[PDB]
Amino acid sequence: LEGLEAVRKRPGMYIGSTGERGLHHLIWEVVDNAVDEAMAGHATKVRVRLLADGGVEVSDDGRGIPVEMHESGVPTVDVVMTQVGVSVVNALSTRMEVEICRDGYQWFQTYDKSVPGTLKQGEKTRKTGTVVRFWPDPDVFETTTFDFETVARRLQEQAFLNKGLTIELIDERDGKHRTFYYP
Ligand SMILES: CNc1cc(F)cc2c1[nH]c1nc(Oc3cnc(C)nc3)nc(N3C[C@@H]4[C@@H](N)[C@@H]4C3)c12
Ligand SMILES: [Zn+2]
Ligand SMILES: [Zn+2]
Ligand SMILES: [Zn+2]
């Protein structure tokens, strides 16, 4: 967790600012990982929800973040959320939730002020994919309001670059919705 403490100590080092543009770094990172699964993991659908409480949910129907034991002796999902680019989202969020469908099972993990909980094996499923929820820390960010039009423009770009990918955007704050798809 030394990397995460470094991000929390100097957030602007990692996301440039703690204003609106800094806040949107977090949604870009999680969206990017979901969209990466379209080229790499045969995902057909990405969904982004702007939650009523300021949180964000991103989901894909890709391979699912690996849950197998990493060489560092913890589930790979914990390595991802502490070491890869998306670990900045974990560092600067009060909490994150991860749901994974892979290897014939649902899996659930939580991060509480970036600290991993205990990976839980849930029910059997033939489905695959990943859901990440995160709640930006208002102690870090001078604004916590995501901009629907800013997010829409990024998702339209990502649909155009990933032909056949459906991207759904839902604003739970006001009900606005958009679906992006290029054949
Ligand atoms: C909402 N969707 C979402 C959010 C998120 F924060 C991270 C991921 C994600 N979907 C993901 N899907 C996968 O499937 C993979 C990738 N590679 C292999 C070998 N197996 C399965 N892997 C993921 N990750 C591990 C590593 C990627 N290069 C990063 C992130 C993410
Ligand atoms: Zn990427
Ligand atoms: Zn493949
Ligand atoms: Zn596949």
Residue numbers in the entry: 20 to 102, 123 to 213, 245 to 253
Q: Mind quoting what the paper says about this structure?
A:
Using cross-seeding from crystals of the novobiocin complex, crystals of Redx03863 bound to the 21 kDa fragment were obtained, which diffracted to a resolution of 1.5 Å. The structure was solved using molecular replacement from the novobiocin complex structure. This new crystal structure demonstrated that the binding mode of Redx03863 partially overlaps those of novobiocin and 5′-adenylyl-β,γ-imidodiphosphate (ADPNP). However, in contrast to novobiocin, Redx03863, is more deeply buried and shows a greater correspondence in atomic positions to ADPNP, most notably in the overlap of the pyrrolopyrimidine and adenine rings. In the Redx03863 complex, there is only a water-mediated interaction between Arg141 and the ligand. Indeed, when we made site-directed mutations to Ala and Gln at Arg141 in M. tuberculosis GyrB, the mutated proteins showed only weak supercoiling activity and were susceptible to inhibition by Redx03863, i.e. this water-mediated contact does not greatly affect the interaction of Redx03863 with gyrase. When we selected for spontaneous resistance mutations to Redx03863 in M. smegmatis, the only mutation that we could isolate was Gly83Ser; no mutations at Arg141 were found, again suggesting it is of minor importance. In relation to Gly83 to Ser, the presence of a side chain at this position would cause steric clashes with the neighbouring structure and most likely displace and/or destabilize the loop bearing residue 83, which also contains several other important ligand-binding residues, namely Arg82, Ile84 and Pro85. We found that none of these mutant enzymes showed any supercoiling activity. This suggests that selecting resistance mutations to Redx03863 is difficult without compromising enzyme activity, which is a feature in favour of exploiting these compounds as leads for antimicrobial chemotherapy.
